Amino acid sequence: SAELHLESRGGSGTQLRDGAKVATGRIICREAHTGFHVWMNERQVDGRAERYVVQSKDGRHELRVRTGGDGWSPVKGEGGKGVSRPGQEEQVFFDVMADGNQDIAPGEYRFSVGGACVVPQEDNKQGFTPSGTTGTTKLTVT
Amino acid sequence: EECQVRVGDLTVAKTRGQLTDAAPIGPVTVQALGCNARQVALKADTDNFEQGKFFLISDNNRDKLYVNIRPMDNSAWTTDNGVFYKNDVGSWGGTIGIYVDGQQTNTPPGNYTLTLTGGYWAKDNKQGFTPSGTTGTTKLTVT
Numbered sequence A: 001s002a003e004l005h006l007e008s009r010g011g012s013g014t015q016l017r018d019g020a021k022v023a024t025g026r027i028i029c030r031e032a033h034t035g036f037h038v039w040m041n042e043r044q045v046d047g048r049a050e051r052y053v054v055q056s057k058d059g060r061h062e063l064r065v066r067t068g069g070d071g072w073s074p075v076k077g078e079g080g081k082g083v084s085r086p087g088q089e090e091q092v093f094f095d096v097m098a099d100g101n102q103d104i105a106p107g108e109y110r111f112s113v114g115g116a117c118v119v120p121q122e123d124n125k126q127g128f129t130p131s132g133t134t135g136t137t138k139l140t141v142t
Numbered sequence B: 001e002e003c004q005v006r007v008g009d010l011t012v013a014k015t016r017g018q019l020t021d022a023a024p025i026g027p028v029t030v031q032a033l034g035c036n037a038r039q040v041a042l043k044a045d046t047d048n049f050e051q052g053k054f055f056l057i058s059d060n061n062r063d064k065l066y067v068n069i070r071p072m073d074n075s076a077w078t079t080d081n082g083v084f085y086k087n088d089v090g091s092w093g094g095t096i097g098i099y100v101d102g103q104q105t106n107t108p109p110g111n112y113t114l115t116l117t118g119g120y121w122a123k124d125n126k127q128g129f130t131p132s133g134t135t136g137t138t139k140l141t142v143t
Helices: none
Strands: A018-028 A036-039 A052-055 A062-066 A083-085 A091-099 A108-111 A137-140 B010-013 B040-044 B055-058 B064-066 B111-121 B129-131 B136-141
Touching (some): A018 A108, A036 A091
Parallel strands (some): B010 B136
Antiparallel strands (some): A062 A091, A108 A137, B040 B111, B111 B136
């Protein structure tokens, strides 16, 4: 159920340019779907689903991340917004490209990106999963 | 983290003849990076550092003047004429001035140069230094 696993391409960095990735996890789905429900849980700007400027663990440094996708679809999210990309696959990866562009001050950026894709109690049946898993990715500078 | 203390060469123009009692005459640009939990420490090289004293050597080697460094007006630092470090760990990067150790009369000099090493310090009086940065070269002009 759910089965969400995250992975980082390094862990930090101090000089993060635009288009630089930070985390790269993978999401899974069960049956036919059209949206891989994934979220970040940080500080989204209202209905911004596919891109949102996240914040650090301590709240003093902002880090914009282009996770969304290119091709994702804003169809609700759990926890902190999120988006769903074509969920026809059983397991896809989603990398969060950070649009920092400049240098980031030393700190820790923790993200709770995770997803389940599966639909809770709605018109689809499948395996009832009303709970989507969350993830944990830290970006400690070091 | 790391601790990478950056420093750059500088040249001041004030003669010893002025400095009567601990006065700042040379703000050395020191910028620490990543030292959020490390005590940034600067220490003159063995050629200018003798027994725990910092002194400027002449360009042609003639006279020496014992001087101590100070953060001017940046944060609280642990003073010492042989070892300079900050007791409070955290980010820092501000110009450290150069004071004088009980003057020295000042015999007609021309130029003075002093090499200051950078890094961090641990404990106290045990010479717990570590090269973590860059060695700067401070030049003092005298008359």
